[PDB]
Structure 1
Amino acid sequence: GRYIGPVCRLCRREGVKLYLKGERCYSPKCAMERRPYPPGQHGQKRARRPSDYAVRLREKQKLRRIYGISERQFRNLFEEASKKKGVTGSVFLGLLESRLDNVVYRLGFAVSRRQARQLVRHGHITVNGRRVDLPSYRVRPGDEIAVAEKSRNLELIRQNLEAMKGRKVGPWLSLDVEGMKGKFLRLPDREDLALPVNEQLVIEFYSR
């Protein structure tokens, strides 16, 4: 499914500016920079005080639509995190960040997460030399996420890695722009992520 369709309507409905197109969510064209109200005929009307279930559902939907992961994989990852020892929320965020498509996005190979998903699915991304075409692939600490030697001549990768010159990467990632590769150093901490999501709200949403 992948929800494929309009994206900045989620930028509007969630009330927080999301980055689903990469660019144009920074440019004054996101429609969140100019239309912050939710979509539909009844978007500009006075909003009623939402229920607690409303708040938790909206927060979980925000966190899910940020990564573009379906409800099935999302709930499975949450249950997997809850089975493990440690804080459920931080482990859940580390699991979501460990996805191959999200790592490709974080490493600057793609401008958006869905563009990264298409780059992975089409075999333009390799892991430790071997080609991997699975967005749900879990990257372990130490894996070298590289670009296919046959794909390093493509225009989009040239553009993205030409813009990545001088740009800093996450504290848990390393980037080699000349070799067009990177390394997943460690699992990111909660302080490492600046996501506008309260993970405890999602934990309480699935606690029901």
Structure 2
Amino acid sequence: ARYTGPATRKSRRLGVDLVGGDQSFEKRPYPPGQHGRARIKESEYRQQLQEKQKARFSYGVMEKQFRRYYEEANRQPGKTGDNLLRILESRLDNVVYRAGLARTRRMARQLVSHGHFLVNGVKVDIPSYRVSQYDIIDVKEKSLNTLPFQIARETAGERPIPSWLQVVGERQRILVHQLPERAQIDVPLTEQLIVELYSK
């Protein structure tokens, strides 16, 4: 089940853009509703939940899903925040988005669910697929002939490709090498709030 309602609601109510190209957010930054300008008392729990909901409604993950990422990240011996960031970025939807093959997380997820992608020559239609180190991502001819994929792959002038991701040619082959560090990932928001909120 995926949130079918408007996507601009999250940014408008919550106070930071998510897609990044929202003209409505910059037109009106205050939350919608008859009384979005009312003063609100500061609360550590408000801001802790705020970071959580920013993260979950930004990456489009399920609540149980994200809690499972939390406990997983906790139980790896590595640092909890970095482990959570990797275990969330390893979603094939976010990987193929940040590789430039999709215009947004929602569209990456929809295309993966419909199954336009091949993983190491094996059919994969699961938006929440797990990508480990040294994996190969392939795109089939039925999807190269697909018009929106062509638009994405010859309009891919979005945010630069990261260190661990890289494309090799026109076939849009996505390869992963190592575990990124938080500093070069430079993802917005702060995992400390989320980890502390679930530490509650």
- Tell me the TM-score normalized by structure 1: 0.90
**1:64 aligned counterpart, secondary structure:** helix
Q: Once the 2 structures are TM-superposed, how far is the Cα of residue 165 of structure 1 from its aligned partner?
A: 6.2
Matched, 1:195 2:170: no
Q: Once the 2 structures are TM-superposed, how far is the Cα of residue 88 of structure 1 from its aligned partner?
A: 0.6
> How far apart, in 2, do the equivalents of 1:51 and 1:168 lie?
36
In structure 1, which of residues 141, 144, 155 is the aligned counterpart of residue 136 of structure 2? 144
**1:196 aligned counterpart, secondary structure:** coil
> How far apart, in 2, do the equivalents of 1:120 and 1:192 lie?
27
Matched, 1:126 2:118: yes
- Within a 5 Å distance, the mapping from 1:78-89 to structure 2 comes to 78-89=70-81
Listed one character per residue, the Cα deviations across residues 3-40 of structure 1 (whole Å, up to 9, x for unaligned) are: 22111111112211111xxxxx42xx531110101121
In structure 2, the partner of 1:172 is: 164
Q: 1:166 to 1:199 in 2, by over 3 A?
A: closer
Unmatched runs of 5 consecutive residues or more in structure 2: none
**1:5 aligned counterpart, secondary structure:** coil
Identical amino acids, percent of aligned pairs:
48
Q: Once the 2 structures are TM-superposed, how far is the Cα of residue 207 of structure 1 from its aligned partner?
A: 0.8
> How far apart, in 1, do the equivalents of 2:195 and 2:6 lie?
28
Q: CA RMSD, aligned part only?
A: 1.6
In structure 2, the partner of 1:41 is: 34
Q: 1:167 to 1:102 in 2, by over 3 A?
A: closer
Q: Is the Cα contact below 8 Å between 1:94 and 1:189 reproduced in 2?
A: no
In structure 1, which of residues 91, 98, 102 is the aligned counterpart of residue 90 of structure 2? 98
Q: Once the 2 structures are TM-superposed, how far is the Cα of residue 201 of structure 1 from its aligned partner?
A: 0.6
Matched, 1:12 2:12: yes
The amino acid across from 2:180 in the alignment is: P
In structure 2, the partner of 1:32 is: 25
Flag the structure with higher helix content: 2
> Between Structure 1 and Structure 2, how many residues are aligned?
200
Listed one character per residue, the Cα deviations across residues 74-95 of structure 1 (whole Å, up to 9, x for unaligned) are: 0011011111102111110011
The amino acid across from 2:120 in the alignment is: N
> How far apart, in 1, do the equivalents of 2:190 and 2:159 lie?
27
In structure 2, the partner of 1:204 is: 196
Q: Is the Cα contact below 8 Å between 1:90 and 1:189 reproduced in 2?
A: yes
- Tell me the TM-score normalized by structure 2: 0.94
